[PDB]
């Protein structure tokens, strides 16, 4: 499993790893 | 030694769009991120967004995000920002800023590099989650006092709070981050304090060299915001 990008709110750790889709 | 250098000034009308770079050198480009920050003529730092060349993954402040894209090319080791219809109040020197090296790869925080800046005029046609605040916005002081200022995050930030210092006319340096790491190769005078909402900045022996605009910022959220600077003048 991923981390979304599409929860990633206002989190910069999140957007960091987070998948694109 | 670590280098990014931006694009030259820009020239613009209202309506029209705008694209810079920022060539990095010095590092491995790929396990940092890149993000832009903008200053208005005697104004103070605005964060624009980060961008990452490791993913490609971005995220723009809001009051932007309509108008503004940001890229990297990995292969020249370039990162792009362009900016949109364009208006009277988007005159500004434009910085691109390496985000320090983080807990995860390329994420964005406080610069430990900055670009010279590129100016971007655009002519005349006539004539923020977390606000961050300083105190005081001016203080006069002579070489040998301890300077202190203040500054509050309106919502709790932990202890994600940097300080960076301005000289006339160059791209700010950051002086302190994680509210009292002492960036490398900043003189020990230099000390930050505080946790949560309060913190402070002293200097405890000021030299000729600290005559400066000062700022803090936060980085626990997205969009980052900066503290509107306090100067620290000479005595008159």
């Known amino acids: 499993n991923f981390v979304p990008c599409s929860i990633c709110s206002n989190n910069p750790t999140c957007w960091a790893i987070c998948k694109r889709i | 030694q670590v280098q990014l250098v931006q694009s030259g000034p820009e020239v613009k009308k209202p309506g029209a769009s705008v694209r810079l770079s920022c060539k990095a050198s010095?590092?491995?480009?790929?396990?940092?991120?890149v993000s832009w920050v903008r200053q208005a003529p005697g104004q103070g730092l605005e964060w624009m967004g980060w961008?990452?060349?490791?993913?490609?993954?971005?995220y723009y402040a809001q009051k932007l995000k309509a108008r503004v894209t940001m890229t990297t090319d990995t292969s020249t080791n370039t990162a792009y920002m362009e900016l949109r219809s364009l208006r009277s109040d988007d005159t500004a020197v434009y910085y691109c800023?390496?985000?320090?090296?983080?807990?995860?790869?390329?994420?964005?925080?406080?610069?430990?590099?900055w670009g010279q800046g590129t100016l971007v005029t655009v002519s005349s046609a006539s004539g923020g989650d977390t606000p961050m605040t300083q105190s005081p916005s001016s203080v006069s002081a002579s070489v040998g006092d301890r300077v202190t200022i203040s500054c509050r995050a309106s919502q709790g930030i932990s202890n994600s709070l940097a300080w960076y210092q301005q000289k006339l006319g160059k791209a700010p340096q950051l002086l302190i981050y994680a509210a009292s790491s002492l960036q490398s190769g900043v003189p020990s005078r230099f000390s930050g304090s505080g946790s949560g909402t309060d913190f402070t900045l002293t200097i405890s022996s000021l030299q000729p060299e600290d005559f400066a605009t000062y700022y803090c910022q936060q980085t626990n959220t997205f969009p980052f915001t900066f503290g509107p600077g306090t100067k620290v003048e000479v005595r008159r």
């Open positions: 961008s990452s060349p490791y993913n490609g993954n971005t």
């Open positions: 010095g590092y491995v480009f790929t396990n940092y991120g």
């Open positions: 800023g390496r985000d320090m090296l983080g807990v995860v790869q390329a994420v964005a925080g406080p610069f430990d590099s």
